[PDB]
Amino acid sequence: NPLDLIAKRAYPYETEKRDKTYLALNENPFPFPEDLVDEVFRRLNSDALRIYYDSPDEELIEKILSYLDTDFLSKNNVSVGNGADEIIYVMMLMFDRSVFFPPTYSCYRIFAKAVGAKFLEVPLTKDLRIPEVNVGEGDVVFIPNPNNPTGHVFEREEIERILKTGAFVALDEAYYEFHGESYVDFLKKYENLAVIRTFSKAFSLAAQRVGYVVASEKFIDAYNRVRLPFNVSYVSQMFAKVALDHREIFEERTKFIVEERERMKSALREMGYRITDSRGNFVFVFMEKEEKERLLEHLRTKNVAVRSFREGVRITIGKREENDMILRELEVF
Amino acid sequence: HMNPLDLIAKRAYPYETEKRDKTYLALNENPFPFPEDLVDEVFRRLNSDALRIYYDSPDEELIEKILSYLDTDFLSKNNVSVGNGADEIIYVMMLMFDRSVFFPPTYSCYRIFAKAVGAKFLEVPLTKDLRIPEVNVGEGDVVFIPNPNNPTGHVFEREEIERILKTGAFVALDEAYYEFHGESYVDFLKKYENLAVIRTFSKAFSLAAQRVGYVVASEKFIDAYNRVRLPFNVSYVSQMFAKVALDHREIFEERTKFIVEERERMKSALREMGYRITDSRGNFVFVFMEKEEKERLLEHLRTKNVAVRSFREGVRITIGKREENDMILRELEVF
Ligand SMILES: Cc1ncc(COP(=O)(O)O)c(CN)c1O
Ligand SMILES: Cc1ncc(COP(=O)(O)O)c(CN)c1O
């Protein structure tokens, strides 16, 4: 009964009914602009819906390349996924062993167990530094940068130290847009690196699932052989193309989210909370289990959702009134 | 002495995109565009605030509408899930079981995906009469059986499938072409825990570019499947397309009726010409041809900007519009 083994081995699947003020999945506070939804639909060919539509199409790759804005990338350095999740998932199917460093993205462990990958979890140090680990060729090492859930940034030397082991580094730059530095340039020097990106956070397209990966031609070829061939829909691609053609609105939204993040980080410091230097669309607050659970319960009654972790809570940046409500809840507590 | 990227390149087939000829009859696609009225309905129902969230996949409404379409008394929400195409459902099932079993001539992606993900698999060819062969299978195996079969379009008897179910092996019944045949083996789930039926919106609803498949099975299996698959695997808008299609099935019913009549008309004409064909019940016909005579037909078709699908024993020709079908028959008549 293989299905019993999956009950034992893999984590259960659950749908959770969202609270009124939901600040728990690092989603953008803003709806996708209505004008751009309109543009999407006046670009749609109903005759195109009936066919197996190339994933990615050429135009989406040209626009992603234009967004990346390098001198050295070509179309063979870029592919797409059904979310960044798919890219991670597929990478776990590709290598002998997956390595990651708690506190990290919760789906690494989940997907490893889901697909029965060999994996090694070694915790980040007390200072949130990457630990000493025995890794090499055959391994893929998943490093989110900025880190999730801490939002902190690993120094370049840290990433490079792993790169010099020969292990394959999967640099998950899901929160790149809120930080503004990318290690994509390291592809000039290292063949053993892939940078993973998404439209979900900064472009308000989490429901449409478009991720992309930037890597060497050898890797991208291999990835494209292992993934599903028609993995991103015609309309998801069109949403991503239209978003890339109108970046100014998204830049203004990002600017608001970062200013709102830093304002919250300052207020929390002034209150005496121990926080991380987060560079994502969220803040991380350290708290003790007992302080945490009392706060959580209070938020529960006020119809607010944040994300609980072992060492504290991760609060996504929302709208000005939501952010102020959070600060007020933390002040009393 | 080989880095993992070289191993993949060795074992897995290359990624290759196709160039579409002016008359393309090679991927079992619906001839008709998705209705314009329904595209506008999707745009109308679309909530731009929903676009920014990790949207449930499947949402509750999509499930309700799939159940209503299936129209049984005994299925609940716990018996149904979704995939990013039926392709994803197959792919995940291959990750779920110890061994994958299929029977050539069969769906080309089974072998491809097995090799892609490094699944252990067993390929045993169908008999001369297109019957499922004697095979040593049991618990731990998943046996992929398309019904109607792809590329032959022929229908397996219930007894053939029930024999496999009784082994204890898990049967994945791929009902991608159900709509063009009209009988389903979903009622077997009253009795067998041991079974999943896979379905798609791609062929009958002209939504191949939006990738919505669904699977119907026991609660135990669906739970397991939902643990192994990507949690947000089908997009908000893909789900809205599928929901709107299910709210307006009469147009799709008339299209399916046209496709089946068109298929049977072609099957008759080909028999009258002296071609050996299968009794196809999909949106396509399968014509047996000797290798060398088949290649000659292909050059003619290539010369005339027509794509069909070439197989070891013949060609699988998807039903298109009346004018493309008529043209196929001319070229098979003159040939
Ligand atoms: C670190 C990290 N990586 C990947 C993802 C996935 O994003 P996507 O919506 O594009 O699958 C997320 C968000 N769940 C993330 O936080
Ligand atoms: C037998 C079979 N099964 C599954 C599929 C997949 O359908 P989908 O387009 O929804 O991935 C196809 C079509 N590619 C098929 O022919």
Swiss-Prot record, chain A:
Family annotation (Pfam families): Aminotran_1_2 (PF00155)
Known EC number: 2.6.1.9
PANTHER family referenced in this protein's UniProt entry, alphabetically: HISTIDINOL-PHOSPHATE AMINOTRANSFERASE, HISTIDINOL-PHOSPHATE AMINOTRANSFERASE 2
Protein name: Histidinol-phosphate aminotransferase
GO biological process assignments: L-histidine biosynthetic process
One Gene Ontology MF term: protein homodimerization activity
Keywords: Amino-acid biosynthesis, Aminotransferase, Histidine biosynthesis, Pyridoxal phosphate, Transferase
Residues carrying N6-(pyridoxal phosphate)lysine: K201
Listed PROSITE patterns: AA_TRANSFER_CLASS_2
Pathway note: Amino-acid biosynthesis; L-histidine biosynthesis; L-histidine from 5-phospho-alpha-D-ribose 1-diphosphate: step 7/9
Catalytically driven reaction(s): L-histidinol phosphate + 2-oxoglutarate = 3-(imidazol-4-yl)-2-oxopropyl phosphate + L-glutamate
Domain of life assignment: Bacteria
